[PDB]
Scaffold this active site. Structure first.
Site, short mmCIF file in Angstrom:
data_model
loop_
_atom_site.label_atom_id
_atom_site.label_comp_id
_atom_site.label_asym_id
_atom_site.label_seq_id
_atom_site.Cartn_x
_atom_site.Cartn_y
_atom_site.Cartn_z
N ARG A 175 -3.35 1.18 -4.37
CA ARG A 175 -2.94 -0.08 -4.56
C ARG A 175 -2.92 -0.75 -5.93
NH1 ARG A 175 -6.82 -2.91 -0.12
NH2 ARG A 175 -7.69 -0.35 0.02
N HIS B 53 0.71 -1.09 -0.08
CA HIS B 53 0.11 -0.40 0.46
C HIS B 53 0.49 1.52 -0.01
CE1 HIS B 53 -2.67 3.55 1.70
NE2 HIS B 53 -3.94 2.31 1.62
N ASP C 93 -9.11 14.70 -4.07
CA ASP C 93 -9.48 13.14 -3.81
C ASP C 93 -8.91 13.40 -5.71
OD1 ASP C 93 -10.01 10.67 -5.44
OD2 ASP C 93 -10.72 9.78 -3.52
N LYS D 239 -6.38 -0.09 -7.50
CA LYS D 239 -7.82 -0.12 -7.29
C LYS D 239 -8.18 1.48 -8.29
CE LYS D 239 -9.02 0.83 -3.80
NZ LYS D 239 -8.36 1.18 -2.31
N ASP E 172 -10.84 18.59 1.35
CA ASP E 172 -10.66 18.91 3.16
C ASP E 172 -8.94 19.50 2.63
OD1 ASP E 172 -8.83 16.49 2.66
OD2 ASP E 172 -10.64 15.67 1.33
N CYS F 81 -4.08 12.04 -2.84
CA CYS F 81 -3.03 12.36 -1.56
C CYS F 81 -1.89 11.64 -1.89
CB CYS F 81 -4.25 11.48 -0.49
SG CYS F 81 -4.51 10.19 -0.89
N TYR F 82 -2.47 10.51 -3.44
CA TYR F 82 -1.05 9.37 -3.17
C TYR F 82 -0.11 10.21 -4.27
CZ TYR F 82 -3.85 5.77 -1.13
OH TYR F 82 -3.98 5.49 0.12
N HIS G 205 -5.99 16.12 1.69
CA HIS G 205 -6.19 16.73 0.31
C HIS G 205 -5.46 17.88 -0.54
CE1 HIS G 205 -8.14 12.93 0.15
NE2 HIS G 205 -7.85 12.00 -0.42
N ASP H 249 -5.97 8.96 -6.91
CA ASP H 249 -6.79 9.72 -5.41
C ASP H 249 -5.41 10.73 -5.31
OD1 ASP H 249 -7.28 10.99 -3.66
OD2 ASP H 249 -7.94 8.40 -2.28
C1 LIG Z 1 -11.63 8.38 1.14
N1 LIG Z 1 -10.56 8.54 1.14
C2 LIG Z 1 -10.03 8.84 -0.51
N2 LIG Z 1 -8.57 9.34 -0.11
C3 LIG Z 1 -8.52 9.21 1.87
C4 LIG Z 1 -9.78 9.65 2.07
C5 LIG Z 1 -10.19 8.52 3.84
N3 LIG Z 1 -9.34 9.41 4.64
C6 LIG Z 1 -9.28 10.90 4.22
C7 LIG Z 1 -9.71 11.97 5.12
C8 LIG Z 1 -10.35 11.58 6.38
C9 LIG Z 1 -10.71 12.72 7.98
C10 LIG Z 1 -10.36 13.88 7.29
C11 LIG Z 1 -10.07 14.60 6.29
C12 LIG Z 1 -9.06 15.47 6.06
N4 LIG Z 1 -9.23 17.22 5.93
C13 LIG Z 1 -9.03 13.71 4.90
C14 LIG Z 1 -7.86 9.21 5.06
C15 LIG Z 1 -8.23 7.40 4.87
C16 LIG Z 1 -6.93 6.80 5.37
C17 LIG Z 1 -6.26 7.77 5.94
C18 LIG Z 1 -5.20 6.89 6.68
N5 LIG Z 1 -3.71 6.40 7.35
C19 LIG Z 1 -6.20 8.85 6.28
C20 LIG Z 1 -5.03 9.41 7.13
C21 LIG Z 1 -3.78 9.85 7.26
C22 LIG Z 1 -2.81 10.52 7.73
C23 LIG Z 1 -3.20 11.34 8.53
C24 LIG Z 1 -4.12 11.24 9.23
C25 LIG Z 1 -4.87 12.45 9.52
C26 LIG Z 1 -5.95 12.19 10.06
C27 LIG Z 1 -6.59 11.47 9.92
C28 LIG Z 1 -6.91 10.79 8.28
C29 LIG Z 1 -5.97 10.66 8.57
C30 LIG Z 1 -6.99 10.36 5.75
C1 LIG Z 2 2.38 9.23 8.74
C2 LIG Z 2 1.15 8.72 8.72
C3 LIG Z 2 0.06 9.42 9.85
C4 LIG Z 2 1.40 7.89 7.56
C5 LIG Z 2 -0.21 7.88 6.97
C6 LIG Z 2 -0.20 7.40 5.58
C7 LIG Z 2 -1.57 6.72 5.03
C8 LIG Z 2 -2.17 7.61 3.80
C9 LIG Z 2 -1.83 5.78 5.04
C10 LIG Z 2 -3.51 5.55 4.83
C11 LIG Z 2 -4.03 4.38 5.84
C12 LIG Z 2 -5.41 3.23 5.10
C13 LIG Z 2 -5.38 1.92 5.53
C14 LIG Z 2 -5.81 3.29 4.03
C15 LIG Z 2 -6.60 2.72 3.12
O1 LIG Z 2 -8.08 2.87 3.96
P1 LIG Z 2 -7.22 3.39 1.71
O2 LIG Z 2 -6.32 2.99 0.83
O3 LIG Z 2 -8.74 3.02 0.88
O4 LIG Z 2 -7.09 5.10 1.49
ZN LIG Z 3 -7.12 10.52 -1.04
#
Ligand SMILES: Cn1cncc1CN(Cc1cccc(C#N)c1)c1ccc(C#N)c(-c2cccc3ccccc23)c1
Ligand SMILES: CC(C)CCCC(C)CCCC(C)C[C@@H](O)P(=O)(O)O
Ligand SMILES: [Zn+2]
Lengths: 401, 312
Positions: free
Chosen positions: A269, A226, A330, A272, A337, A277-278, A340, A275
């Protein structure tokens, strides 16, 4: 533009006629994306890729101060909102008023636990995520004050409190375990200079077990490769100086395969969807991989670009992930948000800036005003802030006991 | 006891059984930042949570309250914690709780605390009897929920429940042969039960994989899998490989066939082979095709492989 070109239309999905839930969805995005691409032809305007910097700035500026109840869902990740926002601005080269920064300083202080580390908000149990965020934040600010908010002696205690015998860490007391924790720990420890000799004992090996048959890295050994976890892993290893603990080759082939031939953006992935963020989690691996490979004297390495289509990614972001009202997202259709926003921009910058010792081939799509400030591929904060921080804490002794 | 959603649900401040307690409000400092404007409801419940927590009042009423606090923000791990404390202290029926978490997960299959919470329960009860069925359900609504799969792998390893998982895998693969999670799971399973050293298994596996390939030639998973099980022992140890692959050139071609070939060639070089020179040429030409025509999105990579292919 690479994407608006006519042959690029061949990079369209090959359903093989065997349609599955996956084909369907992919195809769906592809059309939505095509539209955006053809946006220009239908309207008869010359395509002009521009980063709505002001609109983004007003968005960020606002959020740094207050958010709607739509943000209740994050009531436990406030330091994060700090970071995200405080970084985007950072990238947008925008200002961080000496007063606002203070407030932040002051707020984070309230998030800091008496046991070390940070909580999602005032009074919350410390957690590595918010901790990683808090620190980065404080760093982005980078002032005696900010730095002085961080209780190093306590940080260590905390860090040790989560350390596991097999080398992994918990995210928090009684909490789960996955790579995130490793990266979190490594990032904050290194920056603050609290790395003792045994602190990360065996951690590199644990992370190494997360790399699977895909070449990618998963959340815990045995799990699917991932993007988000892969960055954490690699980055983590880079910090500990043990990237070689992995099979970088296959790692490379995996990440590079993660870029969508038709969309330009990355997927977290295999099989998938794209997105924004990636744009960072995946694309950032390359700069990391460059060092690594160059580190073991790799001659075949470029001196001007990352091993991924910098062009395509910039297009995708610019064309598809920007929100008129401000903020990134996304993908088209998805809401905006700060997460992203923070990572699309981070990706952009990654895509816009290359280096390799003394080389510096920037690549800025569309309006040159689109270029962003540079960001560190490991910590994801201004390389200058990184350097600035580590050295400041360097003049402090590692809390030996 | 009173649903967050009852038309007849209500403010704790406003409650008779909740008057002996003074609602502790959140302290964001004189000059807030990223401050969320909570609903009177959200604020109500939490002001009270702050108190009960602060007092460490380990009571039934507190218990019921975390429920509301969790529904309001299921991501709140602190509340999730205190709840686990109450579970132990008040000595609550855990199976009852299992049901709770079961419903919550159905609602937020992508939250981190909920899944961990469940794992704790299972651990506490040492009872995995419901897991595989539950997970299957969730994967039934989203065949790719990372957490679900993760959770499943834990249940399978910990309680050594390997017996019917491959069958399951085969089921899901039939539903969407492009489901990378399943392919992974497939690897997880075999590699932990029989391993790929077993000639028969090995052969079985590729055969099968070669099928899926020769069925949906542009599905990348199959390819990565075939490469996966193979590449750990050397593609070049595999003679007919190149050939059969070579046969699919016009019949099932994709940049994957080409990449794979480039991969074979690589190993055939690492191990040194007659005609190597030519091999190297054939390989470099593929590199260029992929780089120039076949798969340009990663032209940086494909040319890099061409350059590396030069030194080594
Ligand atoms: C559906 N989708 C498609 N792309 C991303 C998503 C979901 N979404 C966005 C998310 C969630 C909650 C709040 C915000 C904001 N702003 C963004 C996610 C999904 C998985 C993870 C994981 N692991 C995270 C995440 C990553 C890093 C720091 C964080 C800090 C707080 C909360 C979540 C965090 C966010
Ligand atoms: C230093 C960090 C908190 C890094 C977080 C990095 C990430 C974006 C991790 C993503 C967590 C997971 C399991 C996401 C999955 O639900 P999905 O591939 O559907 O977005
Ligand atoms: Zn994303």
């Amino acid at each position: 533009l690479y994407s608006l070109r006519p042959e690029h239309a061949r990079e369209r999905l090959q359903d093989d006629s065997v349609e599955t839930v996956t084909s369907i969805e992919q195809a769906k995005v592809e059309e939505k994306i095509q539209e955006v691409f053809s946006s220009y032809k239908f309207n008869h305007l010359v395509p002009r890729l521009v980063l709505q910097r002001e609109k983004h700035f007003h968005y960020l500026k606002r959020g740094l101060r207050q958010l709607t109840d739509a943000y209740e869902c994050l009531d436990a990740s406030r330091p994060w909102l700090c970071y995200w926002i405080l970084h985007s601005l950072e990238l947008l080269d925008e200002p961080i008023p000496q007063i606002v920064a203070t407030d932040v300083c002051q707020f984070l202080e309230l998030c800091q636990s008496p046991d070390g580390g940070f909580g999602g908000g005032p009074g919350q149990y410390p957690h590595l995520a918010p901790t990683y965020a808090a620190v980065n934040a404080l760093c982005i600010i980078g002032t005696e004050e900010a730095y002085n908010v961080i209780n190093r002696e306590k940080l260590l205690q905390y860090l040790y409190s989560l350390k596991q015998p097999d080398g992994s860490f918990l995210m928090h007391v009684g909490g789960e375990v996955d790579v995130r924790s490793a990266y979190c720990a490594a990032s904050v420890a290194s920056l603050t200079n609290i790395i003792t000799p045994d602190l990360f004992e065996g951690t590199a090996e644990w992370i190494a077990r997360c790399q699977n048959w895909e070449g990618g890295i998963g959340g815990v050994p045995g799990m699917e490769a991932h993007g988000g976890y892969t960055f954490c892993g690699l980055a983590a290893l880079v910090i500990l100086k043990k990237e070689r603990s992995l099979n970088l080759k296959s790692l490379l082939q995996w990440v590079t395969s993660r870029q969508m031939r038709f969309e330009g953006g990355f997927q977290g992935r295999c099989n998938k969807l794209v997105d924004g963020c990636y744009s960072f989690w995946q694309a950032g691996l390359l700069p990391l991989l460059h060092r690594a490979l160059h580190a073991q004297g790799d001659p075949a390495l470029s001196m001007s670009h990352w091993m991924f289509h910098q062009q395509a990614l910039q297009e995708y972001i610019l064309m598809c992930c920007q929100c008129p009202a401000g903020g990134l997202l996304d993908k088209p259709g998805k809401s905006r948000d700060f997460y992203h926003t923070c990572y699309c921009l981070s990706g952009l910058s990654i895509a816009q800036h290359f280096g390799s010792g003394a080389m510096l081939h920037d690549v800025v799509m569309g309006v040159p005003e689109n270029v962003l400030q540079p960001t560190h591929p490991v910590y994801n904060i201004g390389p200058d802030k990184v350097i600035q921080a580590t050295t400041h804490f360097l003049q402090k002794p590692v809390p030996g006991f | 006891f009173l649903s967050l959603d009852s038309p007849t649900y209500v403010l704790y401040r406003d409650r008779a059984e909740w008057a002996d307690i003074d609602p502790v409000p959140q302290n964001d400092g004189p000059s807030p930042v990223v401050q969320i404007i909570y609903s009177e409801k959200f604020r109500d419940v939490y002001d009270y949570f702050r108190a009960v927590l602060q007092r460490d009042e380990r009571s039934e009423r507190a218990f019921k309250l975390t429920r509301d606090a969790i529904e309001l923000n299921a991501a709140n791990y602190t509340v999730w914690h205190f709840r686990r404390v109450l579970l132990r202290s008040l000595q609550k029926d855990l199976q009852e709780e299992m049901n709770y978490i079961t419903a919550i997960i159905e609602e937020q299959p992508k939250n981190y605390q909920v899944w961990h919470h469940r794992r704790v329960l299972v651990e506490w009860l040492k009872d995995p009897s419901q897991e595989l069925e539950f997970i299957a359900d969730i994967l039934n609504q989203d065949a790719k929920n990372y957490h679900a799969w993760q959770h499943r792998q834990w249940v399978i390893q910990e309680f050594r429940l390997w017996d019917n998982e491959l069958q399951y895998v085969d089921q899901l693969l039939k539903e969407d042969v492009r489901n990378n999670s399943v392919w992974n799971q497939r690897h997880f399973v075999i590699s932990n039960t029989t391993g790929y050293s077993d000639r028969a298994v090995l052969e079985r596996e590729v055969q099968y994989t070669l099928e899926m390939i020769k069925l949906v030639p542009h599905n990348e998973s199959a390819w990565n899998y075939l490469k996966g099980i193979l590449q750990d022992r050397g593609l070049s140890r595999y003679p007919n490989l190149l050939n059969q692959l070579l046969d699919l050139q016009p019949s099932h071609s994709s940049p994957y066939l080409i990449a794979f070939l480039v991969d074979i060639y690589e190993d055939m070089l690492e191990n040194q082979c007659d005609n190597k020179e030519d091999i190297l040429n054939k390989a470099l030409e593929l590199c260029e095709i992929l780089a120039k025509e076949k798969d340009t999105i990663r032209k940086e990579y494909w040319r890099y492989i061409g350059r590396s292919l030069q030194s080594k």
